[PDB]
Amino acid sequence: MAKKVNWYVSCSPRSPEKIQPELKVLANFEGSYWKGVKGYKAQEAFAKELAALPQFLGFSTRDRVAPMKTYGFVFVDEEGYLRITEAGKMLANNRRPKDVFLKQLVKWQYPSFQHKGKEYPEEEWSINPLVFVLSLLKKVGGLSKLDIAMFSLTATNNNQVDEIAEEIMQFRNEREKIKGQNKKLEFTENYFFKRFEKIYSHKSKIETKMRNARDVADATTRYFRYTGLFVARGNQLVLNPEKSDLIDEIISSSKVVKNYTRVEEFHEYYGNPSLPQFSFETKEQLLDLAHRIRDENTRLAEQLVEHFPNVKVEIQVLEDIYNSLNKKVDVETLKDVIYHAKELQLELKKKKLQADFNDPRQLEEVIDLLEVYHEKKNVIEEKIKARFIANKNTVFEWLTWNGFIILGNALEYKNNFVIDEELQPVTHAAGNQPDMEIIYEDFIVLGEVTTSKGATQFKMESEPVTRHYLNKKKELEKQGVEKELYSLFIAPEINKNTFEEFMKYNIVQNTRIIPLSLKQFNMLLMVQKKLIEKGRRLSSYDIKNLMVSLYRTTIESERKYTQIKAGLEETLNNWVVDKEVRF
């Protein structure tokens, strides 16, 4: 048949936040001829402007554009011109972008204008993929990436939820009986092999399909987590329990519209970011929602403010946000207040972790997981696969960032990697950003981490770390922010040449890059764990003193690699001794 048997979240890009800067560029081409030969001039000029983005400096145009069509941001009208829908104009302008994605992905259906005709016959196809996963999870609790790959992508109709839920429950019951981890895996892989054989050099072909399903399941979890309707718990996608009422309405009102064959008519609906219109989206009920989020944020800050006065930052931001409602109480203003209020709630939740780390087992879990990264590559993959959806490179950013939260005292713990509504990690930081920026009262630390080693580490890290550092120093000067800037570079094993290159930049180009082995970083967290056991904890000054001290050693030590390396070990030990804790 021409007929496809699975749906698809493109891997270009694999994470949803990279659409917005592409779409902003594409919006400059609105009203250009875009189809057939008259369309060459515009597609070509777009290709080029898109090439200049930082995200491409460190493909076929039609492959970059396809997802923007699939999610209803853009279309080609019947006279062949490029048009940007209202959803695409909101996203280009960066207005409530997770809520734009949430409404586009809820309307997303097969068949559709992009997916119709002989390949997508109505006899087989009638599904809203995101709502299908919502309904499924109601039955099966959680789905791993592999579960999504095996069971979900090959659903082609909303009406299959009950039968696939049944099948999963029974697959988990068979697996559950199989004794021992390695036999469990074989069984899992055998079920997956046969299942996909019935669905589609032979063994080669069917393994390609399983791998494509795995790759797509990954992008699927990242786009779905971006809407906030789903979050990760361990290595499983689960429903977000803060969204239950929304998720029930979504399931109850979703639909596959029949009018998909004609472009303008289908996009007057699909391109409308007002739709679907949810019950609570009246002035009266959005007031109530804004007020409930205000109370949640108040409760969180109330409970932390005495022992963690760095919540003062979010308290003031909340006030600024809700003050808008002194001027205007219309639907659009209420939606902006709610969007920014939920963002600020996530900031309060990062500061809540400082309270959770008062429990020595929570603090020690981060230490033990960081220790996993001294093991062999294959051991790290397997241990991280069992506990996270994100790959082990992103999880190392996330663990290091938890490291900084454990140390305490920041005004802002700015992860540049993406996390979801439960603060679990999603996607690595972009190549033009440090992995995190930790902002303190009078200094700033860029956290730069890598699991890389050897020449590969020099190649991957030497230049980006120095450029991130000098870019931020220039930005701070431009903004008149007078705080001294440091970058803390952490790897399981710091390569000699990398180390030397940063020492050269500190003394020659006036950077303040401080390289610390993972072992040295974990010593810090062990220090703080021992202080908390005694009713004490590091102050902001303690952390500043460590960064200043280590920095001074980098530029004052004798120039030999082994001398600067020993100087740093000694400076670190001095600061550790000073804390009067015991190993």
Side-chain angles (χ1 to χ4, degrees):
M1 224 94 92
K3 94 183 194 326
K4 333 289 264 205
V5 294
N6 62 274
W7 45 271
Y8 181 77
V9 173
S10 154
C11 287
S12 303
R14 72 171 55 246
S15 65
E17 68 300 333
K18 297 166 88 150
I19 291 172
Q20 182 284 332
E22 302 176 317
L23 176 57
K24 181 170 176 52
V25 182
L26 189 55
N28 301 323
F29 299 83
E30 193 283 339
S32 296
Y33 208 95
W34 195 262
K35 173 215 41 197
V37 308
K38 303 204 286 89
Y40 296 165
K41 188 167 193 201
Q43 301 203 19
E44 187 63 16
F46 166 69
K48 293 173 316 218
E49 201 180 324
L50 178 83
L53 283 173
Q55 70 152 294
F56 290 111
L57 305 162
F59 307 97
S60 100
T61 277
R62 208 187 29 74
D63 304 324
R64 293 325 290 189
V65 173
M68 281 178 268
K69 292 182 184 185
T70 299
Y71 299 132
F73 299 129
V74 312
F75 67 94
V76 170
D77 66 17
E78 312 223 317
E79 301 65 20
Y81 297 91
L82 182 63
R83 298 293 178 208
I84 311 300
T85 56
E86 283 308 303
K89 274 162 201 121
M90 250 184 98
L91 182 60
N93 287 323
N94 212 220
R95 298 228 324 288
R96 306 191 296 276
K98 301 167 147 168
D99 283 350
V100 179
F101 271 91
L102 182 164
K103 287 215 189 162
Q104 298 310 107
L105 296 175
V106 159
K107 293 184 290 212
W108 182 34
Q109 49 173 253
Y110 285 79
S112 70
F113 185 69
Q114 283 292 281
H115 309 289
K116 54 182 183 327
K118 314 310 221 96
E119 288 192 298
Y120 300 91
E122 315 199 71
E123 298 75 68
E124 182 176 7
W125 283 100
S126 174
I127 188 172
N128 299 282
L130 179 154
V131 184
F132 170 80
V133 187
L134 292 172
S135 285
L136 184 53
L137 291 174
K138 278 181 156 201
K139 299 292 189 153
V140 305
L143 296 159
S144 76
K145 287 181 285 179
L146 185 52
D147 289 345
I148 293 160
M150 287 170 62
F151 292 108
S152 289
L153 300 186
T154 49
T156 71
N157 201 305
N158 290 318
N159 73 13
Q160 318 189 255
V161 175
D162 282 342
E163 82 200 42
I164 292 145
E166 281 306 341
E167 180 183 351
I168 294 179
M169 287 308 69
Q170 195 125 25
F171 162 84
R172 287 182 183 158
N173 287 153
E174 288 298 316
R175 182 176 71 181
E176 180 60 80
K177 274 175 205 132
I178 308 327
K179 281 317 163 222
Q181 184 62 22
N182 181 52
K183 283 308 146 165
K184 285 192 199 270
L185 295 198
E186 306 222 359
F187 173 86
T188 296
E189 168 81 351
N190 181 255
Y191 192 110
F192 185 3
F193 187 88
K194 291 182 181 178
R195 187 186 174 87
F196 261 42
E197 190 169 49
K198 303 119 177 69
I199 284 157
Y200 300 83
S201 172
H202 195 250
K203 181 198 68 189
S204 167
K205 331 198 279 225
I206 286 199
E207 278 167 347
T208 281
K209 286 327 165 79
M210 296 149 90
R211 204 150 59 260
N212 297 339
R214 285 185 310 247
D215 279 15
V216 159
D218 177 13
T220 302
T221 62
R222 305 199 194 204
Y223 278 65
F224 285 14
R225 291 165 76 194
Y226 195 67
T227 69
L229 290 171
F230 306 86
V231 297
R233 253 155 217 196
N235 70 356
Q236 301 202 105
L237 189 80
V238 305
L239 308 166
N240 184 344
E242 299 183 4
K243 311 277 189 182
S244 285
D245 289 344
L246 180 58
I247 287 164
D248 294 335
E249 181 163 355
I250 280 161
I251 283 153
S252 182
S253 85
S254 285
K255 61 181 151 163
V256 182
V257 303
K258 272 139 205 171
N259 55 101
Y260 51 82
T261 64
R262 220 75 190 274
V263 70
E264 295 265 353
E265 187 188 0
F266 179 63
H267 300 270
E268 282 184 7
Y269 159 74
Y270 190 42
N272 188 335
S274 287
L275 310 174
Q277 196 202 303
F278 294 124
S279 65
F280 58 88
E281 305 180 307
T282 57
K283 177 163 115 190
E284 296 71 17
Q285 286 186 58
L286 288 167
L287 278 153
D288 297 348
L289 175 58
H291 293 319
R292 182 175 63 85
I293 298 169
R294 171 87 198 220
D295 282 359
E296 296 163 351
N297 289 353
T298 296
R299 279 173 212 124
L300 274 170
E302 279 180 345
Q303 300 157 2
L304 299 165
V305 73
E306 146 160 285
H307 298 269
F308 299 97
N310 66 355
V311 307
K312 65 172 161 61
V313 170
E314 290 82 14
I315 291 170
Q316 176 63 51
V317 167
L318 221 61
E319 185 74 359
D320 295 336
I321 286 164
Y322 280 83
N323 287 155
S324 303
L325 298 170
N326 290 318
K327 293 76 189 186
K328 295 184 281 181
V329 191
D330 61 42
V331 163
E332 189 63 21
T333 305
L334 282 158
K335 292 180 168 169
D336 283 341
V337 162
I338 288 168
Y339 192 91
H340 291 320
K342 282 302 280 195
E343 287 185 307
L344 195 90
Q345 184 169 292
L346 200 78
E347 299 295 290
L348 281 165
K349 286 164 166 164
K350 301 173 172 184
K351 303 254 168 98
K352 189 178 162 205
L353 300 167
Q354 291 166 316
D356 296 358
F357 288 129
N358 279 335
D359 172 358
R361 292 177 184 177
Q362 277 278 277
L363 190 177
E364 185 67 40
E365 252 154 50
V366 168
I367 302 173
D368 301 343
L369 280 172
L370 282 168
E371 292 288 357
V372 172
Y373 291 79
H374 298 297
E375 311 281 325
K376 290 293 174 70
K377 186 148 191 160
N378 57 298
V379 170
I380 302 166
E381 293 170 5
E382 166 267 306
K383 294 202 174 152
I384 294 315
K385 200 212 133 139
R387 292 161 178 87
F388 291 94
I389 291 166
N391 80 21
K392 67 144 170 105
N393 296 347
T394 302
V395 173
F396 196 61
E397 299 177 302
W398 183 86
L399 285 176
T400 291
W401 170 80
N402 272 287
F404 280 101
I405 292 172
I406 281 165
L407 299 179
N409 307 109
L411 299 182
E412 182 177 342
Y413 298 101
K414 188 190 183 190
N415 43 294
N416 288 319
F417 56 89
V418 170
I419 58 185
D420 63 16
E421 299 276 283
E422 282 195 358
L423 272 42
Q424 292 286 129
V426 189
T427 292
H428 200 276
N432 62 341
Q433 291 278 54
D435 302 285
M436 62 209 79
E437 178 174 354
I438 314 295
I439 299 173
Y440 303 83
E441 190 53 61
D442 54 348
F443 61 114
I444 296 158
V445 182
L446 308 181
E448 290 281 27
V449 308
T450 183
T451 66
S452 209
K453 269 178 181 183
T456 303
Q457 179 182 289
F458 189 81
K459 180 186 195 201
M460 225 165 89
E461 299 299 324
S462 277
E463 189 275 338
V465 170
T466 60
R467 176 189 42 94
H468 296 155
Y469 184 96
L470 291 165
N471 288 350
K472 181 74 190 194
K473 184 163 170 180
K474 275 190 217 182
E475 197 186 44
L476 299 176
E477 282 167 354
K478 201 148 208 292
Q479 297 170 354
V481 174
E482 296 170 34
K483 304 185 176 173
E484 303 275 31
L485 176 77
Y486 298 87
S487 295
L488 186 68
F489 178 74
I490 300 145
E493 208 194 8
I494 293 174
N495 171 74
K496 169 186 181 155
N497 295 333
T498 310
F499 179 101
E500 281 182 307
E501 179 75 356
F502 297 152
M503 303 296 100
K504 171 185 326 172
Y505 267 79
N506 284 5
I507 204 169
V508 176
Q509 326 261 349
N510 196 29
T511 61
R512 310 193 165 192
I513 301 165
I514 301 164
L516 271 191
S517 68
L518 172 61
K519 176 173 181 190
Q520 294 177 322
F521 185 71
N522 249 314
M523 274 183 245
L524 310 179
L525 306 192
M526 299 163 171
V527 168
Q528 173 77 320
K529 185 184 187 205
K530 299 175 208 279
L531 302 169
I532 289 160
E533 286 180 24
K534 298 167 196 191
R536 295 200 273 140
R537 66 177 62 237
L538 292 171
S539 58
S540 183
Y541 167 83
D542 290 323
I543 290 161
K544 186 188 163 139
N545 175 51
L546 174 67
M547 297 300 92
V548 175
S549 291
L550 291 173
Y551 162 59
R552 294 311 308 191
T553 300
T554 68
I555 58 167
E556 300 168 3
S557 174
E558 312 259 315
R559 294 292 94 186
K560 287 287 139 46
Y561 168 68
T562 57
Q563 295 169 303
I564 303 164
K565 203 190 151 235
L568 298 164
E569 292 176 356
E570 200 212 335
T571 296
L572 180 64
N573 183 261
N574 285 354
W575 180 90
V576 167
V577 175
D578 174 75
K579 303 294 169 293
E580 279 173 18
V581 277
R582 295 170 165 195
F583 297 95

